[PDB]
Every structure is written in structure tokens, then in C-alpha cells.
Amino acid sequence: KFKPYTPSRRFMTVADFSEITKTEPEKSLVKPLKKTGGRNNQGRITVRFRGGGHKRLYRIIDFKRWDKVGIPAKVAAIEYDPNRSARIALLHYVDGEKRYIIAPDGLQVGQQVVAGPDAPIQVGNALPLRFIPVGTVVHAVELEPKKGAKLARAAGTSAQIQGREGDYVILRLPSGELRKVHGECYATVGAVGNADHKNIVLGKAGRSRWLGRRPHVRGAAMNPVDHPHGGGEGRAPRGRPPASPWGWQTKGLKTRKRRKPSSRFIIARRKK
Amino acid sequence: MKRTWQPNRRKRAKTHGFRARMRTPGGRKVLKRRRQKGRWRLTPAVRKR
RNA sequence: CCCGUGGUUCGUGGAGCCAUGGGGGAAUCUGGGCGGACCACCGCCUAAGGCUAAGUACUCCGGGUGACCGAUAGCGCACC
RNA sequence: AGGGUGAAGCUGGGGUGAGACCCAGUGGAGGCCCGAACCGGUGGGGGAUGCAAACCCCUCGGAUGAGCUGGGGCUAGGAG
RNA sequence: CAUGAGUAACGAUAAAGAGGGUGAGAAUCCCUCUCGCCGUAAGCCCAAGGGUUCCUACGCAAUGGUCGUCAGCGUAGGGUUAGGCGGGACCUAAGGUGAAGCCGAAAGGCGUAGCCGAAGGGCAGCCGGUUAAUAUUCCGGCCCUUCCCGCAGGUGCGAUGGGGGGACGCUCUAGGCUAGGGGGACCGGAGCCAUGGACGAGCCCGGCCAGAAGCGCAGGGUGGGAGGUAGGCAAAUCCGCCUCCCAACAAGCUCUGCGUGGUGGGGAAGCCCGUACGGGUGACAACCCCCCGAAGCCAGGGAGCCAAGAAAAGCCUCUAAGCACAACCUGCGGGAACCCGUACCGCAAACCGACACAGGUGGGCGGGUGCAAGAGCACUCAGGCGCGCGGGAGAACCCUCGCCAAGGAACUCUGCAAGUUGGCCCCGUAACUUCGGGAGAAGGGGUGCUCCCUGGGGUGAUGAGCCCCGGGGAGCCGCAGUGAACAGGCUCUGGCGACUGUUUACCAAAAACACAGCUCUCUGCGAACUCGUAAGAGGAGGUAUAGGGAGCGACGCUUGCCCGGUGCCGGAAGGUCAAGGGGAGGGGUGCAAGCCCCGAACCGAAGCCCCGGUGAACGGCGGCCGUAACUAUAACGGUCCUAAGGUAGCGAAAUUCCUUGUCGGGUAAGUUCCGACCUGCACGAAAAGCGUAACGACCGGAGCGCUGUCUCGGCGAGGGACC
């Protein structure tokens, strides 16, 4: 029920460089799931470019485990949703009920794993940080206990356990930074399920992108009647500005944001 | 040649009606205004069927 | 009483009194704002609750009068 | 409407260790290719108080996709 | 109220001519007879929307673009009725409302819940007959629907709260049934040879449609238990988790074919009569046989592929609590069932454009022949017409369309146009290439129809039952054999751009913008922005492979020189200043304690200065002078200047004015383009630079082909012009 990434159509005219992926569980989801409105327009004013749609399923997923902190679960199997950067495992809880959950590193259908008060540090179970075997990996992870799985490292194979101090453990998050969460808080054990996805290649843009749902963006689009920047000519403007009365693209946003100093440091950057 | 007309028993009837006018304050207001300021009636009455 | 503002014949000013948005932050008739930014005087009024009549306004509607109009002026509109 | 194209998987036959990979059959995917209904509307032509407040003709592009379309709705006018 | 004007014009070049009729008058009404155009629509059909009108009877002064005894016109009267069609008496999404709640100077903003709110859900009938007129609504035959009263048999019955459940892409697609095509000389029938012929498997007409369920084709939708039954999906045997047996092409329970009760219809002619709307009409039928079949139906299939496809009845399943003695499941009898709806127009003179405007406007085969296939083609079936002003000769000339020869672009800014050319089958097919392809490259050749020998996929084996090519052979007639209508002109080459596209409604088919894919860079989620007066939503039930700002824009090679100024990014040591904290001190009044100013030593926020950082960040990347045996530049030869001073590729280009630059090619000649050169008036990598196959209604340069296009064209047909 894993999934092929690479399959690429071939020379079926410019449908060139189209990357397929196929989770093998292929089953159509199950019983627990509604749908999302057609947002893009919202609070009934309209906003943010692109946006279009394309077919309609729509998710409900588990984001909180302490709610059975124990009932082993066995991979119902693999599958996913018209959302999320890295598929899911519909899991079965030994008590009858099941739940759509993450999809850490390639686990295995039928596999038992669970979590709570002491779970075996086997990628799959989840645990209050504290049970953090420092130097290990998780994601999903949530600071401010109860505030549900906060930091759903999307396909975000990224929760790197980095030491502890006080009632907070240190973590290396996607981004390339290290924040802190009080141990009692929690983490889904292990890592994500998708990345190659991230590399996926798609053919005739219009076709693909739109299918994605998203349409466009078109800067200093000539007639700068608005389009912040210049136009009514070839030449790329100067000032150094962006759409809807913008600050270019090299300035802050944070602030006192009591948030900030409160934890984390590394400051915002990487260097591949 | 989509000369924009082509009404809809529904749509038009719909969009506009006594109710509706009384709903929006502007609706109501204009209502009375016209109504007794100069007689007539109310197209939101104009309706058919 | 400090600044941030409204009133008022006051548009920033030596600019007073009433009035309030911020922070300060009390006096029972030796009480306390008010005449003169302000200080010494005399004087003035009695504040931070309540009630209403009567004299000017208005014209739907009625009556009446017109060096006010005659059907393209008069209400556009003298009559389904 | 209709027609051609002819990938991927697979099945078998072919060559190493198995394998690559080949060939053949199957297949019959979106791009699509051809071309009506459908949707656009240059290229030339035909009206100037024209069938018409944007047309008729000969013609031409897409002809499963960011496609076309009836019904039901929300955003609107210094806003969309 | 005049004026061109009694000229321009009548709404489509889909033609009409006759006879009789009725009339005050009939090109322009009625019948009937000749005749053309639709037919894939000028068909019918549902729906929308119109809302009169529809009919029947009188009438025409207004109205139709004149007519007019015609009407959709005027006057009057009559005309659509349904437990089972539809919609509500039910369900719900988006979506509006909104008891709560959060929120505004006010008016409101936001809003769960419950509600309103759909040809999206769900639900019980069909066919034959009858009116001037309406119909599965009426009549009749046939088949049911729930709800109420009862009774008869049967049960833990008994919410709508838990659950299971109805529920869902797209592409495609096996198997199975009517629709629905089609030949039956196959049976019924009213007739015929007119004309050289044939009365002969001749023509012409028809040879069904509905039918409880009973039943026979297809399939169409799965598990029995038991127990544990640490979830339950709060409350309990119903689901789901674990386990041991039976888990059978299993019995299961939901549409077709026959049924057949059985009813009903049943057409040609034909000729009798009404205007017609019509009717008798032959027994009145014969109503059987064989062929082809779908995107329809069974069916929620079945495979494959992602971009991975809605919420309320029904079956159960327990409280409430009744039930359980009168609750539910189930037969028979009895009795009930209301509200709003049809007329007709209705791809259009009745719906939308102010007109009987040739514009537009949603789904239902779309009869037949032929064509490889087919809603395109040409002629037609039914069914629909004949556009509503006529007759007339027919000259100018615009229109529409036809033919040419001699030459075949010289016309011309442009081969604008138009002609060439085009239907399938076989021979065959270039530089280049992302080896997908450019190929319908390109260039040939073919087909018609006869008779003859020869193989095939159909259908109950398979034998008058059909579709595929056969294959080949001899031969037949035309200038001619996709014989008419559907139907590529082509090749070479260059700039741009990738290619699919959207737009510019009103010129601007097409670059621009898309874009896939590049890089910078922004944000830690109560992200960052976007609207908002809070409230709040949005964002994202997403959660830095993620969500934003951006210049570019497949891909290939490749992105170099400066951050001294600008913005942005980093550090406040220091200089620097608002309010403030503030007190030195001066000050007016104070006989006086005192009351009150001014007040400024010092502390004091970002910012600003300052110091680094900094281009896929604004934005820029030079000037001059000298030297190698001689005659020509090239190397630094040091200097003036600044931040350095433009690399790689690139060049007279969608940037060279001197320019029709100079050479070269093309050419009788060419400022045109291709190639060179390169002293680049004023290219350069990121608003990309050089290149780069495929793809363009791209724009430009060749050349073969063809053609009243050009040397003038010349006659010709159809329409106005003209009487």
C-alpha cells in the first residue's frame, strides 16, 4: 500500500515530465468524513489569487492521542485524502473504532503500534515528549499540551529531538530552527511518509496547476493601474514593491510577539 | 444575442418582492417614499402568475 | 488639576466659563465653581437628580381672503 | 455524431545470473491527429436612414479540457 | 406643417401556374389539381417564459410594412377538472434565515441550533376510445397507492436520538433484453396491364401496442453462528475490534422475455360527402417469419487511472416508556384521500432585441437511400412550407455566380482573393530529432461496371438467411469511372514565442498575459498577508517538501564585474531628539503661612547619523596616452577618473541614423530577406544572454503547382436599378 513516485508518462505530447504515484491500498476511504465549502471567496469578501478546486472528497483526521492512550492499533492499512502532503493510514483501534492517522515512515499494514503513558519508542507509536529518547524523530508534535497535534509536519519529515531543559524539550523543526515544548506535550513517533511527492513533475501547466485547483498570479502585470509595480511598458520597475500595497520581500513580520523569545532560537534560515 | 433581457418568473420574481424590500432598510425606506410620496404601487408587486 | 477634544462672536492664541476622552483624583453652608490668565479683594451663586404647563415653529387636513393664474401659467396634475 | 493514432501495464517467444533490455500480441491512454452538433469568432466579401444599436456569406481555430452547457447561489459598482 | 419623394425602401433569390368556389371587391381567403424548398430540418416533444389566447359565431372603419369578404385583428359566447403526471402536504448542499452567543455612535456586522430554501434526494399507473376545443386528468379496459375503522392471524412492540444505509470520479468496457432499423411474394386487401414489352417470387398497404403475475431467457445488488462483545457510535442483545466452527458456479431479497387473463387499435387505395377540424371506409383485416442492433435499460456491473467522486426516508436497533392486551409485523372486509396546476405559442411573427425584426435561448431517435464511418454531404419519409406587396420588359452599373483563351504574375505594398488542391487503398517518405516526430512530408498509382475460377468473420449445426475483404482472371463502355454533394496546394527559409490556452465585449487570431518549470525572499502557525468599526472570517481542519511577495519563464549551454549612493538585512558603543520623570533656578500676586507660573543640570522610544552586511535587490559596468628591425592594428606602457568598469555567447538585428554600410547569395535586374564582416549612432544574462525539435489563422524572404489575377478582359445567369 506504499506508492510509486517516478512513473512518468512518455512523449504523449508535451504531457512530458508527468510524475505518477500510486499508494497500493487503493481502497476508497471510510465512514468518517464530510466535505469543505468552496473557499477562496470567504467571510464573503473574496481573497488570494489562484484558487479553483477540482472534484470533491474532504477530510476529518485524528490529531489527538491521549484519547485511548493505549488501545493498540493495527494499521487498518494505507490510503489518503484530497488533502495533506503525505498520505495516511486508516488505523484500527483494537476496541472496534478506527481513525485516520498520520502515515509515518513506511510502517506496515496490520502493524501494531499505539501510544501514551510509555509507548515503545518504535516509529508509529506516539508519546508525551518527555518519553523523548533525545536524538530520535517524530512529527505531528504539539507544544501546549491538549492544544492538539500542533505542528503537523505535513509530509514534514522534520521533528528532530534535540536535548531538553526545564519543562521544555528542544526540537529542530522543518524550517531549520529549534523551538521548545513542555515535555508532557506530545509527538507522533518517527517521521513522515512523503517527499518524493515533493519532487513530482507535472505536464502542461494549465492542465496540471489548474487541476491542482489553483489558477494564477501575474505581477507588475502591465497596466499597473494597481499591480503595485510598474507597467504600461516593457521594463521591470524599481521602487522595490509588491501587490496589494506591499513591502517587497526582505523585511520582518514578527514583533514583541511575546511568542518569539518565549522559545525557539536558530533564527530563520538554512543552507543547502 | 443575449440582449440581457430574458427574465425569470423565478429569478426576477425572486430577487424582488415586498418582503425583500422591507428587509433592507434602504428597501423599506424607498418603499414608503415612493409608495405614498407618489402613489402607484410597487413593482415588487409587479409580479405575475 | 495634566494633556487629548467640543462648544462659544474665539481659527490656537495672555484665551475665560460650560462641556467630555484619557491619569490623577474631594470638599457639608469658615462648604465649593463663578466677575478680573493668574495672585491679594469685594461681590455672585448655590452646581456633579427630578416635573410640566403659557407666549415664536410647522404644515397633511377644514374655512376664508388675494393691483395671485386661465387652459402650453397655474399643483406637472381642473377630473376614470 | 463520426474516424485515425497508436504509449503504460500485461501475456507469450528471445537473449544472462537472475536481470537488463528485444521482439511480438494485447492494449487501446488526452495529446490527442482528422474532422460536424458545441465553442470561438481572423482572412477576404456583402449592408451603410442596412434583417440588426454589432449582422449574412465564402472562409477559419479548438473540436475532453485550464472543454461547453440549463437550473440554483455569493462577491457591486472608489467596491467588484 | 412642409422637404427631398410620390424616386429609396417591404425584412432574406426556398419559384410558383391552373380550375372551380365565396364574396360589394378577392395577385394577395376556401377546396381541389399541376409545381419548387425543407427532412435533419423549415421535425415533432418536455421545459422556459408569454400570458392571452384556443375554438365556434358574427364584423373589418384601426392593425398587418397596400391588399384583404384573411388573422395570432374587433364583438360575443364556450373552452383546460388528475389518490396514482408535476409541486407542496417530506429531505437537504451550496445557500438565506436565524432562539443562543460574539460583536456598532446608531442604523448593523458576524451566527450554532431548528426552519426556508433544488427537474440534486425520494414517491403509489398504463393504454385504447370521446369533445369546436382539454386528457395517463373524461370514458372504458386492464394495475396499483398510503391513511383511517374494524375484524383475522403474527410479535419485547415502542423513537428518531447511536449505528448500519441509501452514495455517487473520470476513461473505458464483457454479458443480457425491448426501442428501433431492415428483406419476408410471408398472409390479409382495394386495384393495374395503359402506351414495343411484363399480370410474372410485379407494384401499392399493412403485417402491432398495452397485459396481475404465474411463469421461462439475463443478470443486476453476499456471508450463518456462537461467544469474548474491557469501542460502544454516552444509555441495552443492533454496528466495529478478537476467537472456534459452517462460510458452496449457495437459498437470498430488487428491473427485462414470455405471459397471457385480455382489451384495444388495426391502412393502404378506394370512392361519398365537410372549408377544413373530418368520415365512412374490405372481410375489415392479415397482425406469423428471418435479418441488423445502441451512448438505453438490467445494474448500486466489471477493468484501468488519479486530479482519488453531497447532506435528510427505508431495514433494522434499543429509551420514552408504554408496550404487552390492546404498541408494531401481517391478510380480508369496510371507509378515505384536500391545496396550487392542463388551452395554445412555444429553435419561434405569441419567449428575449422598442417592429409579422434572417440575432439568441436548455435536454428527447433525430424516418430513408447512397457515401468506408458518421445528426456533414445530394434526393427524399412522414410532417413542414411557398418568407406576403404584385405584372413588366429586361439597357448603365454594385451586387451573387459561370465560362475562356493567348500568356500565365508581370497586378499588386502584399498572389488580398480566387483557382490549385483535396473521398479511402496500395507503391513510397527528406535535413533534423527532446528518437514522441516531424508524414495526410513528399511523389506514384488506384478505383466504375460485366462474367468467370478461388479464401473469410455471420446466424439454432448451419442449406434461398448477411456483413469483411478476398484474391485473381478475361473483358465492357465513355475525355472522362470519391463520375454530383460532402472534401490538403505545396516545398525551402528566417525573427519571435515553446507547444493548450484567455482577452482585447466595440477594428485590433495575435503579441501580451498565462504558464509547467528558475531564483530571491516572507511566516511559525491563535503563522504571514486580504477584507473587517471591533466582532470575524478568511487563511489552513493546511500546518514550512507547507501557505504568501515576487523578476523569469519548456529544455540545452550558461548565468561574470561593482554594493562608494538607494532600499533591505545585522549591531544601539557612541552623537542625536517627543512625551515624560523633572529640579537648579527665575517669577507675579502674597502684609504673611501661601497661592499659583516660567521652569530646565541629568535620566529619557523608535527612529535618524554611524559601522558591517547586501543583486534571479534599485541601479549602474568607463576616459586618455605610449612601445615589439621597416608598411596595419593587435600584448601593456604607465597614466586622468570612478564602484568597478561588462565575461561568455551576440551584432548592421520586433535596437546601424551615416544606410539602398561593405562583401557574398539570391536576381535580367533588389534599399527585400539568408549568409558573412563587425568602427555595436544606443546589444549583454535575469524585465534573462546564445541556441533550441515540435507546435502559430504568428510577421517577413524564396521557389514548383495552379488559377480572368494581371496584360483591358469578352459574352453569360441570377438581383435591384428602369415602365
Ligand SMILES: NC[C@@H]1O[C@H](O[C@H]2[C@@H](O)[C@H](O[C@@H]3[C@@H](O)[C@H](N)C[C@H](N)[C@H]3O[C@H]3O[C@H](CN)[C@@H](O)[C@H](O)[C@H]3N)O[C@@H]2CO)[C@H](N)[C@@H](O)[C@@H]1O
Ligand atoms: N585581463 C584583461 C583582458 O583584457 C581586457 O582588459 C580590459 C581592462 O582590464 C582594462 O581596462 C583598463 C581600466 O583601468 C580603464 N578602463 C582604463 C584603462 N585604459 C584600461 O586599460 C586599457 O588601457 C591600457 C593603457 N593604454 C592598456 O593596458 C590597454 O589598452 C587597456 N587595458 O583594459 C582592457 C581593455 O579595456 C579585457 N576587457 C578583459 O576581458 C581581458 O581579460
